[PDB]
């Protein structure tokens, strides 16, 4: 049944990138109160299937298309307020609207975008959120302002237990080719062209940005996961304009820059595009196969590109003025030809500390992968794929295999103390004591496991204090060292829950 | 499930007669708020099967007994606000709720008990309550004040029909001889007597009082429409005191007047009554039976009688100075030896008019069956058990026959004009004219059918406004008629719904 | 869920006469129903379903009984004159005698059936001239007459052709 609902506001003038506003999923239910408000009151924990609606007048003369995010873990909230970027909006679930098909439906499976069940009371991670946003705008301004009705419907139910399923378990070996919700931001065509070519970088790997803020992403982590790829590129093309707008598009491949000469463009496998619906277009390169992330100086015109040539059109009746605007979606590599993983099944880099400015230093960790700070030395993170998975779900959980590797700073005859991992269950204050290890500094090695996880199952991707295993890294001849590593290499089974992503 | 609740406070001193409270049916649900009262809001109407469930610590030591009492129809809450006499808290359906049994359960069919469905947003006759008040006090007081929490557990589904099915159907030729809801007031034995006589009188179509205020009541009302009764009185006892305290009666019939030997005492069929119970006692009578009202300088004493004689006890420990209280609750006449029906299938007389000031006289009549007033005119209302039937439910339904009749004040000869009765449809202002119907005055009577009712089914015995068929009488030479006789007849099927009770 | 019909199949008010002037009063029929005017006297029409489907229909026919009831306006003792009912089949000028009938004042009531038709089978809501029944009221003295109240009750079969409308 209906089980909560809010508004949105559209302004008569709708333009790209304006922000609509933001319903929060909890509030919807609570404020409506509600039949299904008063089930969950009951139950404590819910574990919903949604069906959202948004109701919404059909219109094929406006050009409008929207886009709802899914945001569970408050993510771009900050981000879009303002004006929202698609490189934000895309970057989390999300579906397109489009104007011309009217009242809009999806089926959200809580359990799996999400992840943890939700609290009757309060929040218990971060509030979850549904972001409502214009991705192409209005050809011309309609009449007046105007609403749109956002219904959530659900039959509630008692949630069994706190987690999910996970939407994903790291492992480096796999990238299937399969992707979902891999949304490229719009591309636009003027109609003051009798031809026109747009690029779409095939360098999927590459971490998107909006001015000088990186918008980590599961898709181009996965993509990271990999050297290269090659095969066919199967997708779907929108074409986001009023019925009266129209254009023929030449769909191609191509490698390193683009030839000027017409007819070799034809002697190529392309594909032609009248209208929405599917495409598959083979990448083209030299090595059949285009790099995963570009090295230095690289551009991502140099590798592999999916090419849109307007080779008729668009075209409008006087006095049009809008550009007609083209919303790719990439829905899998079919028939894939894969370089080897990028990362094998191995340890790989967490944190170095180094340039110790006190004998005494003590580095807590006790149950989180996160990034370390210090006054006292300086902190170097690593960066890869793993990390950048814990940065783009909402709760994650799983054991890490830790190695410590250490040089001296002093000569090694003169050299005394220890690198001392205490671990306990618990806090430093009242904890009790696990398999802490006196590593004698002589050693320049040792080993350790860590508990990435808490009494509830999983962790988020901030502070919070939940009652589990807790370790610290205790230096007591700091100035000794000249480097420490620290590496990790997961556990099988390290579970990621619900799909975001991380703007920094 | 549990759909409303409330609390009742309970004073440490709870003595007889106490009044604890109303709690309002349509607030308990929707205070609460409530998975049930939200499927109500879409329902709109609903007819539920209520469970009230009355939480209590059970206790043997106090004696204390409280009725809870379902008055649907707002009847009796004026009246018992400052006092609740027993009268007035067992006209209406009741339940005795017994302190050493705890926890109290019923089930309320509000179809039958009250008549007519719930509407969500407002109350449509009157707003239902229960009624809390103390039958039989406490032996000495408590050790403090406590509250009890009532509590409704339904199943709200959509009603199909505005009103339930009739509680009666009006037949003068029928009363079985079987009771709902009839309790005696409680009667007291003092313990500083070693014996001692209680008389509760048979001549059930007596109506109660309450100082100078009459309790018309649906029990005594359907023995009144019998002449007299003989046969066994079926029953049940109930003795209201601390397990410390006990009593042994003998109960038995006598008629006009007690025997003064012990002996003879005795010899009468009678039973021995040592603890809550059924009994069965022969109605003793020289003519088999008792009489169903009381003429004239009568009383009830000089017929036949149900006596409780006290023959061992009451005994309590010392020092202990409560009454011991009996309630008796008679369920039937078994083996019933009745007389005539008190009426036939005929009419009866509904109200003169006489004493006539002004010649131009119009008397609104509706679709009302109810009481006249009058400034320019007396009226002179019957008095019959089909009037009682009206005033003891809530809502009621049907067609009756009339019959007028009337005589001249003037000379025969100089007569004129006519008795009018004008039928519309609607109101005097907009209505629709139906059968009219115009008596030259010479015709001396006339006939005509009345609908009682209106277009939602059924009507409340008070002023209300509802689209009907609409009757008026009209005297053009009023002040030539000595008296304007309405007699009626109800056709088979006149209905009553909600049995309660009428204070005037 | 209906409600109870609003009528029931009983007589309802046609017309009451009233306040009349003159002693001599004569109200045509005819063969129709519909509303009545009067310089002489007061005429009050009843609306009802009835009277409504009539004027919401081109054609109409059927057979309607009639109840006349009325009071007096001068003393019983001193009453004279009759209610007459003349019913013809063609017109007043030419017609042939039907069972007209003659009800004393003093009876206060009469009653008689009333064809609303004619030999084409069915009547306009109009006036018009058809050959068929015709009939009339007629008062001796109107002015010993407080009111002459007129009831109808169609026999069953009461036809309704074309329905249409009727602004006023």
Known sequence: GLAGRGVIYIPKDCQANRYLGTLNIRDMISDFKGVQYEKWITAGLVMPTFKIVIRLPANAFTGLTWVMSFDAYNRITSRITASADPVYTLSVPHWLIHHKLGTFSCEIDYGELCGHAMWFKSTTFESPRLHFTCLTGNNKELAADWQAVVELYAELEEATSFLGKPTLVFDPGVFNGKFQFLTCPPIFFDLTAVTALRSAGLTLGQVPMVGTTKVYNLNSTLVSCVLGMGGTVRGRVHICAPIFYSIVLWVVSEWNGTTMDWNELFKYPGVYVEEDGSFEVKIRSPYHRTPARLLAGQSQRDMSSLNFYAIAGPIAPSGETAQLPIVVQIDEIVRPDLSLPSFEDDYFVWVDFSEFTLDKEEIE?????????????????????????????????????????????????????????????????MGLDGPSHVFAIQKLEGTTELLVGNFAGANPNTRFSLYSRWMAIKLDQAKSIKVLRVLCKPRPGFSFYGRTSFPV
């Open 365 to 429: 960790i006790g149950s989180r992968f996160f990034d370390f700070t210090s006054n006292t030395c300086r902190v170097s993170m690593g960066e890869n794929p793993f990390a950048a998975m814990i940065a783009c779900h909402g709760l994650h959980s799983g054991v890490l295999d830790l190695k410590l590797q250490w040089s001296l700073n002093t000569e090694f005859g003169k050299s005394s103390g220890s690198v001392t991992i205490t671990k306990l269950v618990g806090d430093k204050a």
